[PDB]
A = this chain, B = another copy of it.
Amino acid sequence: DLEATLRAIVHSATSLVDARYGAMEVHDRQHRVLHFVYEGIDEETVRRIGHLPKGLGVIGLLIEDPKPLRLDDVSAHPASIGFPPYHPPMRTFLGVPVRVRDESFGTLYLTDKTNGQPFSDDDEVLVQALAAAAGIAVANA
């Protein structure tokens, strides 16, 4: 039920900022993954990847210190861990925390803006707003 809500927010973000891929992870205070929702990857590829993210690399960075982050090439970030086998290669990156004041619960993130360009300042503002709505949904589950 919560996941369907989170899935709508991802869908809205992905569509509005013209991203090829979008996802949201929600974690407990031990930073164990509770929910993982996404758009842009089909089921056969998901099976081939074979395991859910644990929130490492750049996502781990966002989980460690929740702050908006935009990168031209996520794989060049020093915190990058690299993609697992069969995971689509992704380059441009936009990530923002899913939170309320007292607490950060997760990360909403988008990759590979379909115009081949980096995500914009407006993209970031837009996704922060949708993330805030998601934060309310999570804090109230």
Interface residues of A (CB under 8 A from B): 1-2, 4-5, 8-9, 12, 15-16, 100-101, 122, 125-126, 128-130, 132-137, 139-141
A113 to chain B, nearest CB (A): 15
Tell me the nearest residue of chain B to A2, going by C-beta.
B136
A135 to B1, Cβ gap below 8 A? yes
Question: Given A4-B101, A16-B129, A101-B1, does the pair A9, B122 have CB atoms closer than 8 Å?
Answer: no
In the assembled complex, which residues on chain B have CB atoms less than 8 Å from the CB atom of A137? 132-133, 136-137, 140
Taking chain A's interface residues, is the majority helix, strand, or loop, or is none over half, making it mixed?
helix
Q: Which of B4, B9, B128 contacts A8 (CB 8 A)?
A: B128
- Given A12-B128, A16-B122, A16-B125, decide whether A1 and B134 contact each other with a Cβ distance below 8 A: no
Q: Can you list 20 residue pairs at the A/B interface with Cβ under 8 Å?
A: A1-B100, A1-B136, A2-B136, A4-B101, A4-B132, A5-B132, A5-B136, A8-B128, A8-B132, A12-B132, A15-B125, A15-B129, A126-B126, A129-B133, A130-B130, A132-B133, A134-B136, A136-B140, A136-B141, A137-B137
Starting from the known contacts A9-B133, A15-B129, A129-B133, 10 additional A-B residue pairs (CB-CB under 8 Å) come to A1-B101, A5-B133, A8-B128, A8-B132, A12-B128, A12-B129, A15-B125, A126-B126, A130-B133, A140-B141
